[PDB]
Design an enzyme around this catalytic site. Structure first.
Site, PDB file in Angstrom:
ATOM      1  N   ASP A 110       0.842  -1.188   0.000  1.00 57.97           N
ATOM      2  CA  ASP A 110       0.000   0.000   0.000  1.00 57.97           C
ATOM      3  C   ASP A 110       0.878   1.240   0.000  1.00 57.97           C
ATOM      4  OD1 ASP A 110      -1.977   2.152   0.964  1.00 57.97           O
ATOM      5  OD2 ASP A 110      -3.278   0.382   0.897  1.00 57.97           O
ATOM      6  N   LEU A 148      -0.175   4.139   0.974  1.00 50.35           N
ATOM      7  CA  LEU A 148      -0.677   5.007   2.033  1.00 50.35           C
ATOM      8  C   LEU A 148      -1.006   6.402   1.506  1.00 50.35           C
ATOM      9  CD1 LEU A 148       1.656   3.971   4.979  1.00 50.35           C
ATOM     10  CD2 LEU A 148      -0.593   3.061   4.360  1.00 50.35           C
ATOM     11  N   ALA A 202      -5.737  -2.040  -4.885  1.00 48.47           N
ATOM     12  CA  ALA A 202      -5.244  -0.667  -4.943  1.00 48.47           C
ATOM     13  C   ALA A 202      -5.835   0.083  -6.136  1.00 48.47           C
ATOM     14  CB  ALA A 202      -3.713  -0.656  -5.017  1.00 48.47           C
ATOM     15  N   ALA A 203      -6.423   1.250  -5.865  1.00 46.29           N
ATOM     16  CA  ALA A 203      -7.043   2.058  -6.907  1.00 46.29           C
ATOM     17  C   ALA A 203      -7.253   3.476  -6.395  1.00 46.29           C
ATOM     18  CB  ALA A 203      -8.385   1.460  -7.360  1.00 46.29           C
ATOM     19  N   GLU A 204      -7.452   4.396  -7.341  1.00 53.97           N
ATOM     20  CA  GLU A 204      -7.675   5.812  -7.074  1.00 53.97           C
ATOM     21  C   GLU A 204      -9.032   6.229  -7.633  1.00 53.97           C
ATOM     22  OE1 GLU A 204      -5.773   8.120  -5.361  1.00 53.97           O
ATOM     23  OE2 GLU A 204      -7.717   9.114  -5.607  1.00 53.97           O
ATOM     24  N   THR A 262     -15.227  -3.054 -10.163  1.00 59.09           N
ATOM     25  CA  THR A 262     -16.478  -2.399  -9.818  1.00 59.09           C
ATOM     26  C   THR A 262     -17.568  -2.761 -10.816  1.00 59.09           C
ATOM     27  OG1 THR A 262     -17.613  -0.256  -9.653  1.00 59.09           O
ATOM     28  CG2 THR A 262     -15.656  -0.359 -11.082  1.00 59.09           C
ATOM     29  N   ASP A 263     -18.809  -2.773 -10.335  1.00 58.80           N
ATOM     30  CA  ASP A 263     -19.927  -2.939 -11.258  1.00 58.80           C
ATOM     31  C   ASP A 263     -20.132  -1.726 -12.159  1.00 58.80           C
ATOM     32  OD1 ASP A 263     -21.041  -1.089  -9.403  1.00 58.80           O
ATOM     33  OD2 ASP A 263     -22.857  -2.269  -9.107  1.00 58.80           O
ATOM     34  N   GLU A 264     -19.466  -0.599 -11.889  1.00 64.35           N
ATOM     35  CA  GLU A 264     -19.609   0.566 -12.765  1.00 64.35           C
ATOM     36  C   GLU A 264     -19.012   0.349 -14.145  1.00 64.35           C
ATOM     37  OE1 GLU A 264     -18.774   4.450 -10.997  1.00 64.35           O
ATOM     38  OE2 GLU A 264     -18.507   3.447  -9.062  1.00 64.35           O
ATOM     39  N   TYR A 315     -13.372   7.449 -13.786  1.00 66.06           N
ATOM     40  CA  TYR A 315     -12.971   6.400 -12.860  1.00 66.06           C
ATOM     41  C   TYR A 315     -13.342   5.029 -13.403  1.00 66.06           C
ATOM     42  CZ  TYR A 315     -13.241   3.279  -8.821  1.00 66.06           C
ATOM     43  OH  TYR A 315     -13.083   2.210  -7.956  1.00 66.06           O
ATOM     44  N   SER A 344     -11.322   3.815 -16.206  1.00 68.63           N
ATOM     45  CA  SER A 344      -9.995   3.336 -15.827  1.00 68.63           C
ATOM     46  C   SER A 344     -10.075   1.955 -15.181  1.00 68.63           C
ATOM     47  CB  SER A 344      -9.304   4.339 -14.901  1.00 68.63           C
ATOM     48  OG  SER A 344      -9.901   4.386 -13.610  1.00 68.63           O
ATOM     49  N   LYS A 345     -11.134   1.687 -14.407  1.00 67.89           N
ATOM     50  CA  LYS A 345     -11.285   0.343 -13.855  1.00 67.89           C
ATOM     51  C   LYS A 345     -11.594  -0.663 -14.956  1.00 67.89           C
ATOM     52  CE  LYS A 345     -11.069  -1.042 -10.348  1.00 67.89           C
ATOM     53  NZ  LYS A 345      -9.967  -1.682  -9.523  1.00 67.89           N
ATOM     54  N   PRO A 351     -29.578  16.055   2.587  1.00 62.04           N
ATOM     55  CA  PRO A 351     -29.981  16.500   1.247  1.00 62.04           C
ATOM     56  C   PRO A 351     -30.413  15.322   0.384  1.00 62.04           C
ATOM     57  CG  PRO A 351     -27.599  16.457   1.399  1.00 62.04           C
ATOM     58  CD  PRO A 351     -28.117  16.111   2.780  1.00 62.04           C
ATOM     59  N   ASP A 378     -32.607  18.155  -8.793  1.00 59.25           N
ATOM     60  CA  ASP A 378     -32.167  16.861  -9.293  1.00 59.25           C
ATOM     61  C   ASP A 378     -30.849  17.004 -10.043  1.00 59.25           C
ATOM     62  OD1 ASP A 378     -32.226  14.159  -9.687  1.00 59.25           O
ATOM     63  OD2 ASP A 378     -33.797  14.169 -11.222  1.00 59.25           O
TER      64      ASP A 378
HETATM   65  N1  LIG Z   1     -17.892   0.841  -2.835  1.00 59.19           N
HETATM   66  C1  LIG Z   1     -16.600   0.622  -2.998  1.00 59.19           C
HETATM   67  O1  LIG Z   1     -15.738   1.084  -2.238  1.00 59.19           O
HETATM   68  C2  LIG Z   1     -16.179  -0.205  -4.179  1.00 59.19           C
HETATM   69  C3  LIG Z   1     -17.156  -0.683  -5.041  1.00 59.19           C
HETATM   70  C4  LIG Z   1     -16.799  -1.436  -6.143  1.00 59.19           C
HETATM   71  C5  LIG Z   1     -15.477  -1.723  -6.363  1.00 59.19           C
HETATM   72  N2  LIG Z   1     -14.539  -1.248  -5.522  1.00 59.19           N
HETATM   73  C6  LIG Z   1     -13.062  -1.538  -5.769  1.00 59.19           C
HETATM   74  O2  LIG Z   1     -12.516  -2.087  -4.602  1.00 59.19           O
HETATM   75  C7  LIG Z   1     -11.141  -1.673  -4.463  1.00 59.19           C
HETATM   76  C8  LIG Z   1     -10.937  -1.076  -3.093  1.00 59.19           C
HETATM   77  O3  LIG Z   1     -11.791   0.076  -2.966  1.00 59.19           O
HETATM   78  P1  LIG Z   1     -11.817   0.864  -1.586  1.00 59.19           P
HETATM   79  O4  LIG Z   1     -13.049   1.676  -1.486  1.00 59.19           O
HETATM   80  O5  LIG Z   1     -11.475  -0.116  -0.533  1.00 59.19           O
HETATM   81  O6  LIG Z   1     -10.575   1.847  -1.798  1.00 59.19           O
HETATM   82  P2  LIG Z   1      -9.895   2.890  -0.810  1.00 59.19           P
HETATM   83  O7  LIG Z   1     -10.011   4.254  -1.371  1.00 59.19           O
HETATM   84  O8  LIG Z   1     -10.570   2.804   0.559  1.00 59.19           O
HETATM   85  O9  LIG Z   1      -8.447   2.258  -0.651  1.00 59.19           O
HETATM   86  C9  LIG Z   1      -7.519   2.176  -1.748  1.00 59.19           C
HETATM   87  C10 LIG Z   1      -6.186   1.831  -1.141  1.00 59.19           C
HETATM   88  O10 LIG Z   1      -5.187   1.744  -2.181  1.00 59.19           O
HETATM   89  C11 LIG Z   1      -4.050   2.491  -1.803  1.00 59.19           C
HETATM   90  N3  LIG Z   1      -3.428   3.021  -3.008  1.00 59.19           N
HETATM   91  C12 LIG Z   1      -3.879   4.063  -3.776  1.00 59.19           C
HETATM   92  N4  LIG Z   1      -3.099   4.360  -4.788  1.00 59.19           N
HETATM   93  C13 LIG Z   1      -2.059   3.449  -4.677  1.00 59.19           C
HETATM   94  C14 LIG Z   1      -0.883   3.259  -5.425  1.00 59.19           C
HETATM   95  N5  LIG Z   1      -0.518   4.042  -6.443  1.00 59.19           N
HETATM   96  N6  LIG Z   1      -0.055   2.259  -5.051  1.00 59.19           N
HETATM   97  C15 LIG Z   1      -0.379   1.522  -3.983  1.00 59.19           C
HETATM   98  N7  LIG Z   1      -1.447   1.624  -3.186  1.00 59.19           N
HETATM   99  C16 LIG Z   1      -2.253   2.612  -3.590  1.00 59.19           C
HETATM  100  C17 LIG Z   1      -4.557   3.579  -0.867  1.00 59.19           C
HETATM  101  O11 LIG Z   1      -3.479   4.023  -0.049  1.00 59.19           O
HETATM  102  C18 LIG Z   1      -5.665   2.837  -0.108  1.00 59.19           C
HETATM  103  O12 LIG Z   1      -5.189   2.151   1.040  1.00 59.19           O
HETATM  104  C19 LIG Z   1     -10.844  -0.743  -5.646  1.00 59.19           C
HETATM  105  O13 LIG Z   1     -10.186  -1.475  -6.671  1.00 59.19           O
HETATM  106  C20 LIG Z   1     -12.238  -0.304  -6.103  1.00 59.19           C
HETATM  107  O14 LIG Z   1     -12.282  -0.089  -7.511  1.00 59.19           O
HETATM  108  C21 LIG Z   1     -14.856  -0.499  -4.449  1.00 59.19           C
HETATM  109 CL   LIG Z   2     -30.604  11.531  -3.534  1.00 61.07          CL
END
Ligand SMILES: NC(=O)c1ccc[n+]([C@@H]2O[C@H](COP(=O)([O-])OP(=O)(O)OC[C@H]3O[C@@H](n4cnc5c(N)ncnc54)[C@H](O)[C@@H]3O)[C@@H](O)[C@H]2O)c1
Ligand SMILES: [Cl-]
Ligand SMILES: NC(=O)c1ccc[n+]([C@@H]2O[C@H](COP(=O)([O-])OP(=O)(O)OC[C@H]3O[C@@H](n4cnc5c(N)ncnc54)[C@H](O)[C@@H]3O)[C@@H](O)[C@H]2O)c1
Ligand SMILES: [Cl-]
Ligand SMILES: [Mg+2]
Lengths: 353, 361
Positions: free
Chosen positions: A35, A37, A84-86, A138-140, A163, A166-167, A218, A293
């Site tokens: 991670d 962080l 890991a994702a942004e 993600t389902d998106e 986003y 990219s996923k 809201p 809306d």
């Molecule tokens: N509702 C949701 O949260 C949701 C829904 C569908 C899919 N997902 C997928 O699940 C996964 C986790 O989502 P989340 O909400 O737990 O994410 P998050 O935002 O809570 O956590 C992402 C983590 O990845 C780390 N990270 C970010 N960029 C990094 C990099 N360059 N290198 C290494 N580590 C990095 C961050 O430090 C963090 O700990 C993602 O792949 C997301 O697409 C999440």
């Molecule tokens: Cl709403």
């Protein structure tokens, strides 16, 4: 048998729960939490398992091939579970992490694993697995729905945001490396997660806070925006089960077997939180504030996870109402964790400890 | 509103040079900016015929370098982009393993980001609410039918076919499609995507399949056929592709996707036999002369695949159809090849890469 498994993004919301599931269920396997962080990671999430003998943390950035290589050399990992994702949209940072980051990990897996040229083009053996790239997504990627229908594993990709594009890209890379190089992989796509360790600015925690602090709730348009909601602990259990039991190369949808309009979500939180605090029935409904809306707020996102149950028997352990109850209980029991995020102190954890 | 500046990225390339030419000839009043990094894949000799046209300009720029793109956007305030620049040589060099993603995904985003910054986008057009009015701007994204995966014995690629890219290349192209559509939905950026079959024709590099088969026939070298040669592709004449792009650009509804194919599907063995027939006839050889060059070799995985487009939508919506059958396009391709052994020599020798330094100094 696998000896080392990397969980990327394991300091995050879903990732911490997956780290916990793998550590608890596999004492004979080293679980590496990889991670960078960012603002999204919170090592306070793992305070309970951080001193387990089979848990190790590695601060590393998947957009930095040199850092990843040092972790791959140190542990020689048999598998990667990639979370890991942004999500925040350096305008291309999210592409760097979500797309290039996934390719960097795939390139190292292709390099460190011994891939069989005979398994390319879908010819994965029915034999047990030695390696696996498990891709969490993600389902998106499927876009959005009208009034009818659900996201299936066969639904055409149609990501509608930068986003989710990219996923979707990262999903394609994983599958293409599987087909082209014979890299064992699984992909899973899940609905919105909720539960313990969700950041306080997220929808459900923010509604809990606004209710407790008598702040307006809201509601955009008529609040008809509709999501399937998946308890984060159920999600982590499904990833673990799929990782161990699914056939190589499969895709599974994962969801909570529900769909909720935002107005009904808010009304359910009001109902449970008023009852929890002994307030009169309907006390906090005066907080609901209808506003204009949003364009496209009339959207529906509902995953169909019946394939997963049919193949492996997985099912959610809670209804949304039961999951909200546990989420409210966790929230009210973790004032310190919540405050450490809001204050920003949570980020000092790696430096302080 | 009449556009004044249109960027064609990758316009020094195979398809891009023909797209530049179509826009240049059809739109004398519009400045066509050929934006190209001149990788090994680019060849400015492709545009020698129009390089002095008054509405043509070349800008050497790399779409992975935002500062170079920004300079081009500042100079021309472009109304539209037709985006062909892409990288397909996955595993070309360990010095740059993700070059294909950098060019195909990040490069597309860099272009999208400048369009978002330089264009006036109406927030009322997001979520697919584009008006039925002439466009002021357009991001036209050129992509590949390989985003759809491959086919069995029956069926065709449709615009509604679920993406299933099977190679790192086609995954990166699929990713770029997704970015274009998501910027369109999220920001209201006008866009079109088209996905086409394999192109062939003039200015195709000599190592590509059809030019290499022509060379091997002319030089009495073996023609390897893998397995039964049943590998099947829809083949689109490159000039038909450029014509389709130009027509769609002008006439299609904002936000549409079209698959562009040559209204055919050919097994490799039949393609080689057709080239043999035409080349033998063109050079005065007895019928069947070059069939002895056909050499059957061991089948390889992924060499029985099938890729073919159903272009009903494009034909129904715009009335578009190829100008040639594959046989007629091959005849034109052979004719061009035999008239352009200088161009071919300049690619094979590497001299094509010195054109910019030699002509633009
Ligand atoms: N509702 C949701 O949260 C949701 C829904 C569908 C899919 N997902 C997928 O699940 C996964 C986790 O989502 P989340 O909400 O737990 O994410 P998050 O935002 O809570 O956590 C992402 C983590 O990845 C780390 N990270 C970010 N960029 C990094 C990099 N360059 N290198 C290494 N580590 C990095 C961050 O430090 C963090 O700990 C993602 O792949 C997301 O697409 C999440
Ligand atoms: Cl709403
Ligand atoms: N059969 C085909 O050739 C085919 C089939 C389907 C789709 N397509 C698509 O058509 C488009 C053009 O294909 P082509 O065969 O003409 O390609 P090409 O390889 O002949 O030309 C690509 C051009 O892009 C330029 N370029 C590469 N990287 C660049 C960068 N970073 N910045 C700027 N310019 C850069 C190169 O210099 C070259 O002039 C691509 O998007 C491709 O995916 C091609
Ligand atoms: Cl063949
Ligand atoms: Mg089902």
């Amino acid at each position: 048998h696998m000896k080392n498994i990397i969980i990327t993004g394991g300091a995050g919301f879903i990732g911490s729960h997956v780290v916990r599931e793998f550590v608890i269920k596999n004492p004979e396997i080293t679980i590496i939490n990889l991670d960078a962080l960012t603002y999204a990671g919170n090592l306070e999430n793992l305070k309970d398992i951080e001193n387990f003998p089979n848990y190790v943390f590695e601060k590393a950035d998947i957009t930095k091939p040199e850092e990843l290589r040092k972790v791959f050399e140190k542990y020689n990992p048999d598998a990667v579970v990639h979370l890991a994702a942004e999500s925040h949209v350096d305008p291309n940072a999210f592409i760097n992490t979500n797309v290039i980051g996934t390719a960097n990990l795939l390139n190292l897996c292709r390099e460190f694993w011994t891939l069989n040229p005979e398994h390319t083009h879908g010819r994965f053996p029915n034999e047990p697995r030695t390696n696996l790239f498990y891709h969490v997504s993600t389902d998106e990627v499927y876009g959005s729905l009208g009034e009818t229908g659900f996201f299936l594993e066969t639904t055409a990709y149609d990501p509608q945001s930068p986003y989710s594009a990219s996923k979707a890209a990262s999903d394609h890379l994983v599958r293409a490396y599987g087909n082209t190089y014979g890299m064992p992989f699984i992909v899973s796509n899940c609905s919105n997660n909720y539960g313990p360790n969700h950041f306080p600015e997220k929808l459900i925690p923010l509604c809990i806070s606004n209710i407790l602090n008598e702040k307006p709730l809201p509601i955009y348009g008529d609040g008809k925006y509709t999501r399937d909601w998946l308890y984060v602990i159920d999600h982590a259990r499904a990833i673990h089960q799929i990782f161990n039991e699914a056939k190589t190369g499969e895709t599974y949808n994962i969801g909570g077997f529900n769909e909720w309009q935002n107005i009904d979500l808010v009304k359910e939180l009001i109902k449970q939180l008023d009852a929890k605090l002994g307030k009169p029935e309907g006390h906090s409904e005066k907080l609901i504030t209808f506003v204009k809306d949003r364009p496209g707020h009339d959207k529906r996102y509902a995953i169909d996870a019946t394939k997963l149950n049919k193949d492996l028997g997985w099912k959610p352990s809670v209804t949304f109402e039961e999951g909200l109850a546990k989420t409210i209980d966790w929230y009210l029991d973790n004032k310190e964790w919540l405050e450490n995020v809001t204050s920003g102190d949570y980020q000092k954890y790696y430096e302080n400890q």
